[PDB]
Amino acid sequence: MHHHHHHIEGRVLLLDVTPLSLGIETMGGVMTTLIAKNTTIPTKHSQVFSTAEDNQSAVTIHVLQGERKRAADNKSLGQFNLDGINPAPRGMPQIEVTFDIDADGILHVSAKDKNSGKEQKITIKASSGLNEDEIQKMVRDAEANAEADRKFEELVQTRNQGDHLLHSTRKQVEEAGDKLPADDKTAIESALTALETALKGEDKAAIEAKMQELAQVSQKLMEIAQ
Amino acid sequence: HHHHIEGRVLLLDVTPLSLGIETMGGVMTTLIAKNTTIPTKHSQVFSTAEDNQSAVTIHVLQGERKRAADNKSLGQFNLDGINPAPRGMPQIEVTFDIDADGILHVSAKDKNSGKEQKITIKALNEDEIQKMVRDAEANAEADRKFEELVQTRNQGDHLLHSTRKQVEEAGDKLPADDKTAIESALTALETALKGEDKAAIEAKMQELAQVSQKLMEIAQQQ
């Protein structure tokens, strides 16, 4: 006797639901959703995130509310800081961010360093403002821009992948005095400047091609100097 | 190196597929989304889909498909001991917890009875993962239309049964022509739920609400 008259919703009378999605801002200005809309309070989500660059001592938890992928197109609840992270390469540290909304509708956002054991913790309301004309306007707007939103997401991904290489190679440009051959660092310079201008923009794996081009130039020097 | 936060953290694995449970309508409700960093923990609250429901079946699904039959079943468990009540009343807290080793812990806890059941599933292959993602990509429109359809059906079903309860509440004080109209609208809606069209359903829901005002007040006065 398994599943019949055993089913599940999804809808619970005595409890509130989240009017619209809640999350944090991540590199590239992208909203990473933690608690999705129409989620029934109380709810809790705990997830690990990391620093966006090498030797980074601090991160800003930025709480966003909305269905848009672009952070700026989402309502910004509030933000706080967590510092005192032992330096380490980009992606190395482990920051546990937790969104816990209680029965009263109070969002408890916390960020913890799994290394130091240090945690900054705040509460904020998800229930303020709103007024469903607003909510519906927001979600409808999200429905309108959905394609552009997804495109933007993949774009940002490729982008940050490029930014990492930019910062890296630029930080790796001088291993020693004049160790890197002269006039190579010139073409390299025009290359990565033209890369900074390659992303203020829209497109594409074109950037990616530029990246796979700029990886193998100084790769000579660097690899032989390893 | 300014202030930012990257979602990608190395040394830590990531969910290959979306994980969730089967919910009313035969739809897969996602708790832990695809490409989420392990360890991760998500918790929500669910209720019964029916009145006087003494138990719930937690059916754990993995995949990007909206239909439950279109995803992978990781396991199931029954939670009994639930004090029979109207639907929506019981509070069943469902938790998905994937620890560092990649182990899935799914728990369900009835907050009234305090009784709790918990399963642990271990850790598909690259093929059939990419097959799943592929099927998702291909059928995405059909899936979305399906999810919307089941949302609408759920709405209309709540409306249907609550209205029927309102009728049963006072059927003696309810006018004959009014009763006939209401029951025609109910039968119409019930029939429309079995269909594939949203607009038809929300229409019949509308029309049902249009003739139900007297029923509302009369039910109240009892």
Residue with tokens 């049964």: B161
Burial class of B106 by CB neighbour count within 10 A (0 to 12, 13 to 18, 19+): buried
Angle between helices B176-193 and B213-221 (to 10 degrees): 110
- Torsion sign across C-alpha atoms A157, A160, A166, A169: negative
* C-alpha radius of gyration, chain A, whole number: 22
Domains of chain A and CATH, by start: 1-146 (2.60.34.10), 147-226 (1.20.1270.10)
The sign of the dihedral angle between the CA atoms of B35, B36, B39, B42 is negative
For CA atoms A11, A15, A20, A23, the dihedral sign is negative
Chain A residues touching B4 at Cβ < 8 A: 26-27, 51-53, 59-60
Residues of chain A numbered 94-123 and touching chain B (CB < 8 Å): 94-95
Experimental method: X-ray
Interface touch B47/A9, C-beta < 8 Å: yes
Chain A touched by B175 (CB under 8 Å): no
Of A11, A92, A95, the CB nearest to B47: A11
Q: Cβ(A47)–Cβ(B37) under 8 Å?
A: yes
What gap in Å lies between CA A47 and CA B160, rounded to an integer? 40
Which helix H or strand E contains B214, and what residues bound it? helix B213-221
Alpha-carbon gap: B34 to the closest alpha carbon of chain A (Å): 12
Name the DSSP letter for residue B143: H
Of the candidates B45, B115, B51, B49, the one whose C-alpha atom is nearest the C-alpha of residue B77 is B115
**Residue B3 touches chain A, beta carbons under 8 Å:** yes
Chain A residue numbers touching B24 (CB-CB < 8 A): 7-10
Q: Do A5 and B158 touch (CB under 8 A)?
A: no
| Residues A40, A197: Cα–Cα separation, whole Å | 44
Which among A86, A91, A92, A79 has a CA at the least distance from the CA of A118? A86
Return the residue matching tokens 């630029």.
Answer: A170
> ∠B174-B178-B179 over CA atoms, to 5°?
65
The answer to whether the peptide bond before residue A10 is cis (omega within 30 degrees of 0) is yes
**Reduced 3-state DSSP string for chain A:** CCCCCCCEECCCCCCCECCCCEEEEECCCEEEEEECCCCECCEEEEEEEEECCCCCCEEEEEEEECCCCEHHHCEEEEEEEEECCCCCCCCCCCEEEEEEECCCCEEEEEEEECCCCCEEEEEEECCCCCCCHHHHHHHHHHHHHHHHHHHHHHHHHHHHHHHHHHHHHHHHCCCCCCCCCCCHHHHHHHHHHHHHCCCCCCCCHHHHHHHHHHCCCCHHHHHHCC
Chain A residues touching residue B39 (CB < 8 angstroms): 46, 48
**Angle, in degrees to the nearest 10, between helices A184-196 and A205-214:** 160
CA nearest neighbour of A137 among A70, A69, A67: A67
CB within 8 A of B73, min separation 6: which ones?
Answer: B59, B60, B61, B62
Least Cα distance to A2 among B55, B12, B9 occurs for: B55
Alpha-carbon gap, residue B13 to A90, rounded angstroms? 16
Cβ–Cβ contact B12 with A under 8 A: yes
DSSP state of B52: T
Q: Does B87 touch chain A (CB under 8 A)?
A: yes
CB crowding B110-127: b at 16 or more within 10 Å, else e: beeeeeebeeeeeeeeee
Gap between the Cα atoms of B31 and B58, Å rounded: 13
* Structure tokens, B66: 């909206």
Nearest-Cα distance to chain B for A53, in Å, is 5
Give A63's strand partners: A24, A78
Find residue B78's DSSP bridge partners.
B57
Tell whether B78 lies on the interface with A, counting CB pairs under 8 A.
Answer: yes
Q: Does B43 contact A43 at a Cβ distance shorter than 8 Å?
A: yes
Cα(B194)–Cα(A73) distance, rounded to whole angstroms? Answer: 39
Three-class secondary structure of residue B74 per DSSP: strand
Q: Are A188 and A217 in contact (CB under 8 A)?
A: yes
CB-CB contact of A162 with A194 (8 Å): no
Contact A53, B8 (CB under 8 A): no
Six-digit token string for B130 = 């990419």
Q: Does B85 touch chain A (CB under 8 A)?
A: no
Nearest-neighbour CA in chain B from A114: distance (Å): 12
Q: How many Cα atoms occupy the beta-carbon half-sphere of B119 within 13 Å?
A: 15
CA atoms of A123 and A98, how far apart (whole Å) = 11
Spatial CA neighbour of A49 closest among A108, A109, A94, A114: A94
Mutant choice from B4, B35, B48, B93 vs A, greatest count of A C-beta within 10 A: B4
Contact flag B57-A7 (C-beta cutoff 8 Å): yes
Which chain B residues have a beta carbon less than 8 Å from that of A158?
A: none
B interface test, pick of A2, A3, A4, A12 with most B CB neighbours within 10 Å? A12
- Nearest partner of B2 among A44, A57, A203, judged by Cα: A57
Question: Which two three-digit tokens encode residue B153?
Answer: 């059906």
Interface check for A42 against chain B (CB to CB < 8 A): the answer is yes
Chain A residue numbers touching B48 (CB-CB < 8 A): 7-9
Beta strands of chain B (E only): which ranges? 5-6, 19-23, 27-32, 40-48, 56-62, 72-79, 92-98, 104-110, 116-121
B3, B30, B36: best mutation site toward chain A, by most A Cβ within 10 Å? B3
